[PDB]
Symmetry: D2
Subunit: 293 residues, 4 copies
């Protein structure tokens, strides 16, 4: 039952990008055999065999991990003529680490039920540095017994597994954390922009904010990087802004007013428009440029 | 000219509330003689003038621009009682305009005014772990160092006059919008069916919430909004920041949204901690 | 080719609510034979059965999910229409749902016009709707008798998808127009202005739209009988914000308005979306 | 008592810019004698006598009308030995048409009481085209008997006098109306921007929006001008954004949450930063440039 390497050695990835490839390396170290599918056929890992379709990927894996950008990519690869779900055996596990909507999560869970496949919604908190060090925090929705089955996989890629509740709970908890992260950055960029506009020395201001208790450790790391103009993508603007769009849609469906998060989303739209592929913290540089002019 | 206890033993306070009384206690331990004036009435003095006449250094801790003007200016105000060459230290959270007015007025009296607001609330004042954010001349900041060292753990020299007031506004914005962001995000999670205890405990484990805001979240788990920084003062600070950002023509939509949420917070409970917005949002969702 | 009563007398509706019924009254007067399907309950049992006995299909459903439920599959409307026929979608749905339906119609040889309308139940009563239509010029001309009977003006917005997009533009203006007015009134009341003075004064200024002045007059009397319910206005705002995020366009005023309309929907989903005026009055009155 | 041209022919202006000079022409037509003071000594009407100080203006005028940009300009010319109040005679009327804060309004009313001068806060709704046609709406605070005294002056410059309440009521009603105007424009600019970003033809879209009932007559006029790129200053961004700052300060003092107005203010800050002196409707062009990227 437990998906240890002896019981279920073959883990197939649907999607194999910045996070998934780093996850795969820790799973390979833990004793699993890794394979992957991507629409392009390329991936950052040359030694990982590539399968031609999602169906072919699923037909030769014991467990499937999904790590795709959005609802549309998830639907493109799980359903249809060559979709992954129909390639899985009854009683097997699908682990979705993608950041997708509650609706996409419910659709996949239901489709899994029809095929006899248990789908865990297990998005992660942490970016590429945390993927590198296997210090991700797994946010998982599903039955306790199914989370237990996946324990060795979660343990290999992360430092902590939070059982958020039944199916859908992991996806919702991820949306919560994404909103905190996105609005924390827009808040910081706007506050820095006011300080600079009001004449504060840039080097003094960036170093002073490293000393205050009201900024998170994640955002202090972004602020230090931004002092250096370093926006190499850990979490690109295109993905952060998509997560903000998903959160605002979910909050509207629940009829919860979230004006701070809604404002932050618009700032991250501007960030994405100006540079989709650099780190989402580049809004700091955007705001600096506004006040320079 | 350094303002050590042996050189300037008498520190007189204009305003003596939660923060100031805690600062005054730490300056007493450091060896200064504390006096104070408050509108309501440590030895107390009946007027700002009387307070400044019997003090070597004056420290101001008043709520807003209006209180600052009422106690600094005029024949019974603090400046009229001060002597050329002395220092006034304003720790109040006031506008850049009020700061510039007081600096210029101080100059006419031969008094150097340091704008030295602080980061940290009553727990930080209790433990003298405040961060002092001070604007002024390098040598005047040095004159005040023993006072700043008694009440805090770090003095940040932010620049010339007005730089401390501006840096406090920056930090206020981060603090206020950090709270409104957290309240809204928790509200979504609860509205989407997440178990309350699970959600509060999970958020204590993530790296994207500040230590300050994680403390607020733990208190909110218990419905505890006893004031450390009351909604009326946080919302006032947000009003000041948004006024200054408008005068500088800097678009700050996240801070503007947070300000409106803190207006609602103040309306519903002006005196409980500003983190009570967490409760306000829980009640909306419920 | 033209869908006159002579050439295409039978118009079948998918959905038949507040606007679709009023739409049908005018098409009846124009000489068409009206039939309809709704999931509740001349009424036909399925969308398939509806389409089989209609010459033109008009769709008026609340959201993307309802559109997909009734459009697709063996019991869906498309499975029952003939190549060369035309489906007119007047529903307020997403650009994504619009594109999906257009492509599905192509596979069946069916042209899908996205023709949402501007105007509410009073304009549907008087055939005063403005039709906002995307499609080929020749397909739009085919539908002209139908658009002329239900409305006063047909705007050809561009190719397929252009009507859906133009509707989203107009929905943003309508929604944020109301939230702006509700907050401005709220500030006025909180600052002590007489309520009847204030409502009457705003009726006389040139910066409020005729639509919003009619809402303001109704709100003066506390009348929020639904013409456009909060649940549907807030859904339209959700769609617009999703579309604006997909296009990466920053729209802070529209995003703020959406959050106020989420509160409005939560407090009263079925009253007119203008009830936010009352919601804000109650915030100010405590 | 009634301030008709017969009883009180002389009207002196403190400030004489775009609005005040147009008011002056209609008062001249109604049979008043016009004089003015500006700090610069010049005005768009070269046929009107200029006075060197506010004090000198008030000494030779029966009623004084004030039309200055902001609180700071108001205090500079009302107070002190050279100010207008020092030159007015007990029992005369001061009519302030400036858009200033409720605090500045209360200060000037109390100061006028000390001098025996009743101050009416009478800002106006309407811009330069309405001033040209005397279609202004006067929003006046004060006692009904003092409003009645000023009726012939209000009638010559406007089409409707709204008695908003006691002192301070006109200033507050002007703030209400300014917020509707400002956020009406930012709403329209953002909605147009979405439409353009989604591929709608520019000419089609501007013309289509002229046909819908959810845009005000004022903003329809701005939309037509914006199609033409015409942002000649009727109401410059620097003054609109100042008015929004005043409204958001007042709303914060009243603890009233106004998120749509707050969002609009930030958009008008960007507008002012990019072009302070063009019409405030230039945000439409700003947003078009953002989507052109
Ligand atoms: N900091 C981060 O980057 C984190 C990202 N996430 C989430 O994890 C997911 C993956 O993120 P990254 O690896 O950073 O993205 P990425 O852009 O680096 O990788 C995307 C991968 O998915 C593949 N892909 C695209 N469409 C596909 C389809 N239809 N079927 C299968 N594969 C497809 C791409 O070829 C690529 O291998 C996203 O949902 C993201 O929001 C979660 C935690 C943190
Ligand atoms: N002021 C207004 O009410 C206007 C509304 N609209 C849009 O027109 C559409 C309909 O609006 P209203 O008639 O006012 O709404 P409504 O709620 O009064 O009518 C909805 C109708 O659709 C039916 N329906 C529900 N689910 C269905 C499904 N899965 N398949 C088929 N029919 C289904 C319902 O039974 C009902 O007959 C919405 O997209 C709305 O946003 C557009 C213009 C103005
Ligand atoms: N569309 C508009 O332009 C409208 C403007 N208002 C308000 O009316 C006031 C004037 O606006 P505009 O005439 O358009 O501006 P403007 O800039 O054309 O006129 C300003 C006038 O005041 C004078 N001035 C400046 N500082 C002064 C001081 N300290 N003392 C005396 N005069 C001084 C200037 O020399 C000039 O004559 C402002 O408060 C504005 O917000 C009201 C309604 C509409």
């Amino acid at each position: 039952q437990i998906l240890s390497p002896e019981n279920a050695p073959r883990i197939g990835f649907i999607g194999f990008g910045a996070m998934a490839s780093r996850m795969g390396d820790h799973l390979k170290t833990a004793g699993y055999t890794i394979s992957a599918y991507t629409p392009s056929g390329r991936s950052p890992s040359p030694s990982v065999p590539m399968l031609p379709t999602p169906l072919a990927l699923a037909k030769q894996a014991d467990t499937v991990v999904v790590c795709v950008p959005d609802d549309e990519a998830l639907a493109a690869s799980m359903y249809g003529e060559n979709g992954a779900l129909a390639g899985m055996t009854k009683g097997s596990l699908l682990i979705n680490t993608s950041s997708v909507s509650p609706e996409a999560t419910a659709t996949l869970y239901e489709a899994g039920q029809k095929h006899g496949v248990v789908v865990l919604d297990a998005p992660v908190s942490g970016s590429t540095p945390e993927a590198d060090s296997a210090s991700l925090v797994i946010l998982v929705g599903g039955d306790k017994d199914d989370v237990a089955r996946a324990a060795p996989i979660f343990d290999a890629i992360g430092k902590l597994t939070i059982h958020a509740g039944p199916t859908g709970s992991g996806a919702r908890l991820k949306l919560v954390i994404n909103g905190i992260m996105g609005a924390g950055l827009t808040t910081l960029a706007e506050s820095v922009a006011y300080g600079l506009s009001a004449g504060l020395d840039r080097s003094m201001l960036f170093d002073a904010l490293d000393q205050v208790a009201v900024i998170s450790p994640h955002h202090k790391r972004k602020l230090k990087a931004a002092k250096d103009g370093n926006f190499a993508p850990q979490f690109p603007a295109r993905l952060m802004q998509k997560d903000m769009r998903l959160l605002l849609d979910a909050a509207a469906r629940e009829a919860v007013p979230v004006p701070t998060l809604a404002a932050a989303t618009q700032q991250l739209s501007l960030t994405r428009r100006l540079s989709p592929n650099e780190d989402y913290s580049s809004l700091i540089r955007v705001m600096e440029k506004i006040v320079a002019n």
